Design a protein around this nucleic acid. Sequence first.
RNA 1: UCCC
Lengths: 107, 109
Amino acid sequence: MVISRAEIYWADLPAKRRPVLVIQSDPYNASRLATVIAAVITSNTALAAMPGNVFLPATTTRLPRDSVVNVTAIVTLNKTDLTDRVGEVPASLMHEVDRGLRRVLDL
Amino acid sequence: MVISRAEIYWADLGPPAKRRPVLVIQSDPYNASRLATVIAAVITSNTALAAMPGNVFLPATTTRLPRDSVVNVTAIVTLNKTDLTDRVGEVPASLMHEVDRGLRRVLDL
RNA sequence: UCCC
């Protein structure tokens, strides 16, 4: 399918299904590269207290509940592992993810 | 323990899991915290992946690894602190900067 | 119909 950055996908991890936030750059996403790097998203809002983590409301993400991006949990998944494209994270919130991403990875 | 950035470990990477070298790219503050997990980039012996943009070739002389290796910037894994015990060595500041630009490139940072 |  068409996978691009800043988009939220329901990923298959009986696999344990979880929403993920693609953080890999779009040129690699469009390539023949088999895998996609993403951040694991939880509905546990308590994790938004962690420094790098950002909060995502359900109203913008089309997720069934208010969720939190866990920038400390980074997974590299096959493109085939991604399922539903539920929504896209707006620029303002993705920028907060990028800042938190730089703190965790010292970038 | 005191797992630091730019350091290389042996890890049982889950796909039979694979025993591969990994380069710790998680910052030292988070490494020092009570966070149970550490983020790292997979190191490969397949030196053909060096041609890939963000990837950085690792000379065997500098990494204390058995053979010439390449850090796979597109291969990022989250591991527990307790699973990073087999320590090899640390990637010098000169090569780690190339890993920085590669990580910014792949992750669009 | 989708969180020690």
